[PDB]
């Protein structure tokens, strides 16, 4: 089934992949697990990971780290791994002052009522937010959150029962994929015929692989030894370009490979992904994406309102941001990395672009 | 092991003998009689006709907080008797108040229609 066999890795173009879905319990088993990667499942093409289900508990197995609650909802049944949580750092009960007493008391109210929502007995109605897992060949739910449904009457159950078909027909039954499918389709894949083009593709794959491995810093030789990156780099194009030294094909080609690796990391510097800290080394690089440190610093310098001006500034200007950063840390901070971090921050909701060139946090 | 579900059914199916004896199911109903001696219960519902029974056994549960004519919810299985006909062996049950029985009926009817809609 091609239409069912949606693009590889099941990208989140279809929104549901990021939000707790609402399927019949009985259907939760009929879905496939993805053969491409474990820990993700499929229904009518739409990929699912986070699931929402509400029913009644019918059986218990209690363990030291988790409970295991069997749960039913009419159409079917499953069991649910409900990780426990302890009360480490115990809050005492003391005759504190008015404010402290009130804080402690309200905290205790919240805590005790949370317990009452958490504790459970067979036949009760239970809600669970979590994801699909499988073990011993059996499929189950590992809940992110679970709480007792405090309804005195079946009205809300009735609502859900009436609803689920509606949401099915509206959203989940829709299989179609509206993506344009703008695939390169392996044009010059085995050979770029152009050392700059090879370097661009090399930088692509290398930044991909670094973000995958989450490596924050790296000596360039460490990267130059990667199997996939090497394979990509050593395609016949570089061997033919460096072939002028016929008597040293191996040596000249390996040197050209090291040079084109240097060129790729330099392209990353130009595009602000990676940068060479003032470490005194010649081929050591720090990746901006993982540079939580600079993220924190540049977030300090505005999250706390801009410290230099007395006036009630709403944030700071691109140039003054850059200048105060270079002042407080290092003049050598390239604008490329600054732009990259400013992008990532608003992606994270750590900064907002009220306009271009001026920002707040 | 994980039991079979509490699939929804109503008194008409037991009265019509449709729902097969020796099978799991779930239903609501109106309390009619309770036997403290033998732990047996009768709930009643009428097809716009004479009230139809539902024989139940009080196993692992407490029949409290709602009265005769008031409303209860049960799930378990039924088994046959020559003289008594058949009785539900309960697995879960509780009282419920302030319900909307026609609404529940609509819900289950729609649910079954949607089942029919499955290819």
Q: How far apart are CA A33 and CA A28, in angstroms?
A: 11
Ramachandran category for residue A75: left, alpha or beta (phi over 0 → left; psi -120 to 50 → alpha) = alpha
DSSP A32-54: EEPSSSSS-EEETTEEE-EEEEE
Distances (CA, A) of A192 to A96, A184, A224, A241: 73, 13, 19, 11
Give this entry's resolution in angstroms: 4.1
Q: What is the dihedral of CA A10, A11, A14, A19, to 10 degrees?
A: 90
Which two three-digit tokens encode residue A208? Answer: 């991909």
Q: How far apart are CA B72 and CA B27, in angstroms?
A: 9
Question: Which uninterrupted H or E stretch holds A142?
Answer: strand A138-148
- Please, which residues 79-98 of chain A have a Cβ atom closer than 8 Å to chain B? 79
Distance from CA of B82 to the nearest CA of A (A): 30
Q: How far apart are CA A10 and CA A8, in angstroms?
A: 5
Distance from CA of B55 to the nearest CA of A (A): 21
Method: cryo-EM
Altogether, the residues listed in chain A come to a count of 361
B75, with CB counted inside 10 A (0-12, 13-18, 19+), is buried
Which two three-digit tokens encode residue B24? Answer: 């799991």
- Please, which residues 15-34 of chain A have a Cβ atom closer than 8 Å to chain B? 26
Check if the beta carbon of residue B31 is closer than 8 Å to that of residue B96. Answer: no
Residue keyed to tokens 């209690």:
A62
Cross-chain residue pair B5–A152, CB shorter than 8 Å: no
Q: How far apart are CA A11 and CA A22, in angstroms?
A: 20
Check if the beta carbon of residue A110 is closer than 8 Å to that of residue A33. Answer: no
Distance from CA of A158 to the nearest CA of B (A): 7
Question: A120-158 burial by CB neighbour count: b if 16+ within 10 A, else e?
Answer: beebbbbbbbbbbbeeeeebbbebeebebeeeeebeebb
Write phi, then psi, for B55 (nearest 5 degrees).
-80, 135
Distance from CA of B83 to the nearest CA of A (A): 31
Q: How far apart are CA A358 and CA A104, in angstroms?
A: 42
Residue keyed to tokens 């040596």:
A251
Write phi, then psi, for B58 (nearest 5 degrees).
-80, 90
Looking at the partner chain, which of B5, B73, B96 has a beta carbon nearest the beta carbon of A77?
Answer: B5
Write phi, then psi, for B82 (nearest 5 degrees).
-65, -45
Beta-strand (E) ranges in chain B? 23-35, 40-46, 51-57, 71-81, 85-96
Q: In what order do the strands lie in the sheet with A32-33?
A: A32-33, A41-43, A46-48
Q: How far apart are CA A304 and CA A253, in angstroms?
A: 52
Closest CA to B93 of A56, A115, A241, A195: A56
Check if the beta carbon of residue A142 is closer than 8 Å to that of residue A83. Answer: yes
Check if the beta carbon of residue A162 is closer than 8 Å to that of residue B110. Answer: yes
Q: How far apart are CA A195 and CA A237, in angstroms?
A: 8
Distances (CA, A) of A343 to A13, A209, A336, A351, A353: 21, 21, 11, 9, 9
Check if the beta carbon of residue A132 is closer than 8 Å to that of residue A141. Answer: yes
Looking at the partner chain, which of B2, B5, B103 has a beta carbon nearest the beta carbon of A75?
Answer: B5
Q: What is the dihedral of CA A218, A219, A223, A225, to 10 degrees?
A: -140
Round to the nearest angstrom and report the end-to-end CA distance of chain B: 30
Closest CA to A198 of A151, A230, A164: A230
Helix axes A195-213, A249-270, angle to 10 degrees: 70
Helix/strand/coil for A3? coil
Write phi, then psi, for B56 (nearest 5 degrees).
-140, 150
Q: How far apart are CA A199 and CA A177, in angstroms?
A: 33
Q: How far apart are CA A275 and CA A265, in angstroms?
A: 9
The Cβ of residue A279 has, within 10 Å, a number of other Cβ atoms equal to 10
Distances (CA, A) of A113 to A147, A192, B55, B58: 11, 64, 39, 32
Q: How far apart are CA A327 and CA A332, in angstroms?
A: 10
Closest CA to B34 of B2, B67, B3: B67
**Nearest residue on chain B to A75, alpha-carbon basis:** B7
Which stretches of A215-291 are DSSP H helices? 220-224, 227-233, 236-241, 249-270
Please indicate if any CB of chain B lies within 8 Å of the CB of A166.
no
Helix axes A335-348, A318-328, angle to 10 degrees: 110
Question: Which uninterrupted H or E stretch holds A83?
Answer: strand A76-83
Q: How far apart are CA A303 and CA A312, in angstroms?
A: 13
Question: Which uninterrupted H or E stretch holds A77?
Answer: strand A76-83
Altogether, the residues listed in chain B come to a count of 119
Domain ranges of chain B: 1-119
Q: Give strand pairing partners of B80.
A: B86
Q: How far apart are CA A69 and CA A54, in angstroms?
A: 12
Cross-chain residue pair A153–B111, CB shorter than 8 Å: no
Question: Which uninterrupted H or E stretch holds B110?
Answer: helix B101-117
Ramachandran category for residue B105: left, alpha or beta (phi over 0 → left; psi -120 to 50 → alpha) = alpha
């Amino acid at each position: 089934r091609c239409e069912e066999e949606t693009p590889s890795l099941l990208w989140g173009l279809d929104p549901v992949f990021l939000a707790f879905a609402k399927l019949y319990i009985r259907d939760i088993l009929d879905m496939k697990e993805s053969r491409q990667v474990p820990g993700v499942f499929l229904y009518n093409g739409h990929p699912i990971k986070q699931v929402d289900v509400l029913g009644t508990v019918i059986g218990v197995r209690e363990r030291d780290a988790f409970y295991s609650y069997g749960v039913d909802d009419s159409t079917g049944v499953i069991n649910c791994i409900c990780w426990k949580k302890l009360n480490t750092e115990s809050v005492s009960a003391a005759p504190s002052a008015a404010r402290e007493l009130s804080l402690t008391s309200q905290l205790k109210k919240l805590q005790e009522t949370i317990e009452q929502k958490t504790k459970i007995e067979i036949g009760d109605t239970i809600r669970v937010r979590g994801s699909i897992r499988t073990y011993r060949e059996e499929r189950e739910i590992h809940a992110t959150t679970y709480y007792k449904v405090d309804d005195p009457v079946w009205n809300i159950q009735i609502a859900r029962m009436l609803e689920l078909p509606t949401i099915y027909r509206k959203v989940y039954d829709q299989p179609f994929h509206s993506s344009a499918l703008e695939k390169e389709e392996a044009l010059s894949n085995p050979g770029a015929l152009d050392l700059p083009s090879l370097t661009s593709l090399l930088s692509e794959k290398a930044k991909e692989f670094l973000m995958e491995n989450r490596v924050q810093s790296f000596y360039q030789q460490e990267l130059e030894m990667v199997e996939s990156l090497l394979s990509l780099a050593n395609q016949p194009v570089i061997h033919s370009a460096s072939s002028d030294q016929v008597n040293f094909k191996k040596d000249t080609t390996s040197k050209a490979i090291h040079s084109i690796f240097k060129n790729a990391i330099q392209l990353l510097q130009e595009k602000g992904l990676v940068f060479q800290k003032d470490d005194g080394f010649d081929n050591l690089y720090y990746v901006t994406r993982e540079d939580k440190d600079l993220h924190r610093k540049i977030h300090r310098i505005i999250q706390q309102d801009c410290q230099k001006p007395n006036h009630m500034e709403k944030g700071c200007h691109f140039l003054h941001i850059l200048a105060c950063a270079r002042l407080s840390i290092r003049p050598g901070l390239s604008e490329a990395v600054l732009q990259q971090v400013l992008e990532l921050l608003e992606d994270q909701s750590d900064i907002v672009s009220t306009m271009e060139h001026y920002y707040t946090a | 092991m994980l039991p079979k579900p509490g699939t929804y059914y109503l008194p008409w199916e037991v009265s019509a003998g449709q729902v097969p004896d020796g099978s799991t199911l779930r239903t609501f109903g109106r309390l009619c009689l309770y036997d403290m001696i033998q732990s047996r219960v009768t709930l009643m519902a009428q097809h716009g006709s004479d009230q139809h029974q539902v024989l139940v056994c009080t196993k692992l549960v407490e029949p409290f907080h709602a009265q005769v004519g008031s409303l209860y919810i049960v799930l378990g299985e039924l088994q046959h008797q020559q003289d008594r006909g058949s009785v539900v062996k309960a697995r879960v049950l509780t009282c419920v108040e302030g319900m909307n029985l026609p609404l529940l009926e609509q819900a289950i009817r729609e649910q079954r229609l949607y089942k029919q809609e499955r290819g």
